[PDB]
């Protein structure tokens, strides 16, 4: 239930599979690799897996190839990081009824689906929890491990810009940089790694932009054919919803993205007060008060936009009251 019990369970087991969530982000990659590498330094037999393509922005990160898509492994323990429910880990959820499982996560809506669960939403990033676990295990950090652990703290705080960038976040980043974390390398690879094609794709996003409530709600969409027409992928749209929120006067931005055909992810970002986690949660997704998402499969975009935006607008009007 707490960190101490997790540390004991990790110490008790040797053959460990560490799994992150599908559609992985920086915190998923950071948490998976930092924990995997920490456990390996203890002499454990460990593999790492995510049931999803690892985005190209991570390709130069040290040990990125340790994260597998199709591991061949007979683990004694499954460790699930940064994933709020079983569906979030893809095909590895079939191991949950077969292999003892640890959950380490910072989502308030975590269903506590492990045999042991350490869930604390006061952390901005699961990577902060892995940091503390590794230290409690006696893991010695080198600069590569510091860099990998810094990654998740940076990405989940929007590089120290989001409402979750509190004193403990800054303290953790300070400690990791002191230990050799390459903060410039992480920013360059995540933020300064844009294919030029992303600009034309985003212009198409701007052209489709709809505004509601005196400009406080902004939403747009990318259909799958538009991805292909622009030689782009959902890896190319990753920062777009944040760019929509950066428009003056916008309080909540919503981006609907169809990739691949028939799979529609909708990203929600809010600025000052509106809880998008409650909207996403009620729609079957989840996240955090200022950043949340839900994924639909087998539905048509003309049907997804009304359902999401109508529910969003309902809650948004209730919030203004």
Ligand X SMILES: Nc1ncnc2c1ncn2[C@@H]1O[C@H](COP(=O)(O)O)[C@@H](O)[C@H]1O
Nearer CB in complex with Ca ion: 158/286: 286
Tell me which stretch binds ligand X (CB under 6 A): 96-104, 116-124, 182-190, 285-293.
Answer: 285-293
Name the minimum Å distance from CB 255 to its own copies. 15
Question: Can residue 147 be called a binding residue for ligand X (CB under 6 A)?
Answer: no
Minimum CB separation from ligand X for residue 143, in Å? 26
Rg (CA), the chain: 19
104 lines the binding site for Mn ion (CB under 5 A): no
Among 89, 155, 285, 305, binds ligand X (CB under 6 A): 285
- 262 sits in the region (left: phi over 0; alpha: psi -120 to 50; else beta) called left
The rounded distance, in Å, linking the Cα atoms of 102 and 113 is: 9
Asked whether 130 and 137 are in contact (CB, 8 A), the reply is no
> What is the DSSP code string of 269-287?
EESSS--HHHHHHHTT-EE
Decide if residue 172 touches Mn ion (CB under 5 A). Answer: no
31 binds, among Ca ion, Mn ion, ligand X, none (CB under 5 to 8 A by kind): none
Binding mask 171-210 for ligand X (x = CB under 6 A): ----------------------------------------
Helix (H) or strand (E) holding 129: helix 126-136
Residue closer to Ca ion (CB basis): 262 or 284 = 284
The number of residues that bind Mn ion (CB under 5 A) is: 6
* Binding flag, residue 249, Ca ion (CB under 5 A): no
82 binds, among Mn ion, Ca ion, its own copies, none (CB under 5 to 8 A by kind): Mn ion
Distance (Å, rounded) from C-alpha 230 to C-alpha 205? 12
- Using the contact rule CB under 8 A, the part of the chain among 26-34, 81-89, 100-108, 171-179 near its own copies is 171-179
Alpha-carbon distance of 154 to 310, in angstroms, equals 33
CB of 90 to its own copies, least distance (A): 28
Is residue 273 involved in binding its own copies (CB under 8 A)? no
How many whole angstroms separate alpha carbon 192 and alpha carbon 188? 5
CB of 306 to Ca ion, least distance (A): 20
Cβ 205 vs Cβ 240: under 8 Å? yes
Q: How far is the CB of 215 from its own copies (least distance, A)?
A: 9
* Beta strand pairing call for 263-270 and 286-288: unpaired
Q: How many residues bind ligand X (CB under 6 A)?
A: 14
Could you give the 3-state DSSP secondary structure of residue 204? helix
DSSP state of 234: T
Pair of tokens at residue 218: 């902004």
Where do we find the tokens 């590498």?
37
Tokens, residue 197: 């094609």
Output the known binding site: 14, 21, 25, 27, 43, 82, 84, 87, 106-107, 155-156, 162, 265, 267, 269, 284, 288, 295
Give the footprint of ligand X on this chain (CB under 6 A).
Answer: 25, 84, 107, 267-268, 285-288, 291-295
């Amino acid at each position: 239930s707490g960190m101490d019990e997790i540390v004991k369970v990790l110490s008790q087991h040797d053959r460990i599979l560490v799994v992150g969530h599908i559609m992985p982000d920086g915190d998923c990659v950071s948490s998976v690799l930092s924990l995997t590498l920490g456990l390996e330094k203890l002499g454990k037999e460990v593999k790492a897996a995510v049931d999803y393509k690892i985005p190209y922005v991570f390709e130069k990160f040290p040990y990125i190839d340790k994260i597998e898509e199709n591991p061949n492994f007979d683990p004694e323990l499954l460790v699930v990081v940064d994933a709020s429910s079983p569906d979030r880990i893809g095909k590895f959820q079939d191991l949950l009824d077969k292999v003892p499982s640890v959950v380490i996560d910072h989502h308030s809506t975590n269903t506590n689906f492990g045999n042991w669960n350490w869930v604390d939403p006061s952390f901005a990033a699961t990577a902060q929890m892995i940091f503390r676990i590794n230290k409690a295990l006696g893991v010695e950090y080198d600069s590569n491990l510091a860099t990998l652990n810094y990654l998740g703290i940076a990405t989940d705080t929007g590089f120290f810009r989001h409402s979750n960038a509190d004193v403990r976040v800054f303290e953790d980043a300070y400690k990791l940089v002191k230990m050799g974390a390459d903060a410039h390398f992480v920013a360059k690879e995540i933020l300064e790694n844009k294919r030029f094609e992303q600009f034309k794709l985003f212009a198409e996003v701007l052209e489709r932009l709809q505004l509601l409530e005196n400009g406080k709600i902004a939403y747009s969409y990318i259909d799958y054919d538009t991805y292909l027409r622009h030689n782009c992928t959902d890896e190319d749209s990753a920062g777009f919803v944040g760019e929509l929120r950066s428009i003056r006067g916008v309080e909540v931005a919503v981006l609907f993205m169809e990739f691949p055909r028939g799979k529609i992810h909708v990203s929600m970002r809010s600025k000052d007060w509106f809880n998008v986690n409650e909207v996403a949660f009620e729609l079957g997704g989840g996240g955090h008060p200022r950043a949340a998402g839900v994924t639909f499969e087998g539905k048509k975009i003309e049907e997804v936009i009304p359902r999401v935006i109508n529910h969003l607008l309902k809650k948004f009007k209730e919030g203004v009251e």
